[PDB]
Amino acid sequence: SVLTQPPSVSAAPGQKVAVSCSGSSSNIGSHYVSWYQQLPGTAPKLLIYDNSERTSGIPDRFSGSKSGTSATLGITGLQTGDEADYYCGTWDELTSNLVFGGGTRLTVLGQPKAAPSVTLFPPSSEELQANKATLVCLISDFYPGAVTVAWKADSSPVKAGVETTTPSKQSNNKYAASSYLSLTPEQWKSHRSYSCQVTHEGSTVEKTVAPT
């Protein structure tokens, strides 16, 4: 949200990661940063408060620092049990809100990094005959299990009518996701092309379909 974190960090068991948290004068600049650990399917848990202080039970493997408008969570001796979403948080004095970063997914790597395979289908003749249009973006065999999906109508971003899944574990322990763009038939016919853009570990894989 208001604070900026990298979507994904990863390392092998026993190795280290750093999670950056970027804000402004009115939040991180003037106020103390906390870090929250969210294990899969659980409530957040406080790890660190007042920038660098660990809560009870939290090992010295976890460390926090803060300089100006940025903060950093360090984790050394990575264990599979550390796999979680990590959130930075602080007070924002402009809005008088408690604010969070967008979350960082920590993967403790159990297999090689895999870029996603992307398949994009245009609307069927049958759906267009029913006066509707759905673009289907199928995303498979990626690891770690974190992607961002962006839709384009020619060169313009499309944010309306977008429905994207959370990544889910396939049988091979890689991840799958899908994204659906709802259009009018008129929108579909009027553009030169639509694109599904899948960003994984800082690289974008793009597929494009055209009504022609």
Partner: protein, 216 residues
């Protein structure tokens, strides 16, 4: 030492829901408490805060004038009254303790309660073929669009075809309806000679469709 949320569940758009959070700690009345929510697959969003004895309340602009935070210290209970609920309010709602040392931090969290804002009722899917485009392989599939509830079963050629088949987990849309897709990867040389049929069954709506998927 714990917080436990209750009152979550299914509510129609425009409806109301009262969440409760029961606190075990004697110190409950001496601490600020908050509601934080998390939309499925998304980040934490702080919602509301209340002082020890309710003299001060804070709200995110996203819930201001629709939501009211309150507490009854005699019952060690925190409340969130949510009126005029919208689909974008669908989330796990957490109650948490807000404390100050040098600065602010949320040191104790409840388990969370799911709030689903939806008027989704039993509905069969529309099944559309995803035709193969005109590594010597073609992807073809079937779109299973706008059904409720889970689950649907998809097979290809009545289970004869398994290699190359990927049936994707369903998307739960803001509408509260599901969609899923199944894809099979086949040789481009096969498209002229082989028949590909996706077999879709949605038992709750008695919707069973065999859709032939052909080129173009």
């Amino acid at each position: 030492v714990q917080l436990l949320e209750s009152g979550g569940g299914l509510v129609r758009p425009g409806g109301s829901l009262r969440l409760s959070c029961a606190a075990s700690e004697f110190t409950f009345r001496y601490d600020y408490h908050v509601w934080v929510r998390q939309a499925p697959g998304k980040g934490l969003e702080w919602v509301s805060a209340i002082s020890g004895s309710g003299g001060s309340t804070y709200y995110a602009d996203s819930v201001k004038s629709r939501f009211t935070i309150s507490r009854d210290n005699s019952k060690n209970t925190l409340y969130l009254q949510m009126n005029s609920l919208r689909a974008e309010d669908t989330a796990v709602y957490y109650c948490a303790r807000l404390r100050a040392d040098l600065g602010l931090y949320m040191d104790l969290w409840g388990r969370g309660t799911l709030v689903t804002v939806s008027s989704a009722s039993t509905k069969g899917p529309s099944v559309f073929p995803l035709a193969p485009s005109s590594g010597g392989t073609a992807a073809l599939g079937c779109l299973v669009k706008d059904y409720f509830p889970e689950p649907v079963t998809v097979s290809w050629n009545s289970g004869a075809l398994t290699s190359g088949v990927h049936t994707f987990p369903a998307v739960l849309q803001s509408s509260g309806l599901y969609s899923l897709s199944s894809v099979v990867t086949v040789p481009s040389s096969s498209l002229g000679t082989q028949t590909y049929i996706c077999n879709v069954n949605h038992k709750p709506s008695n919707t069973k469709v065999d859709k032939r998927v052909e080129p173009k």
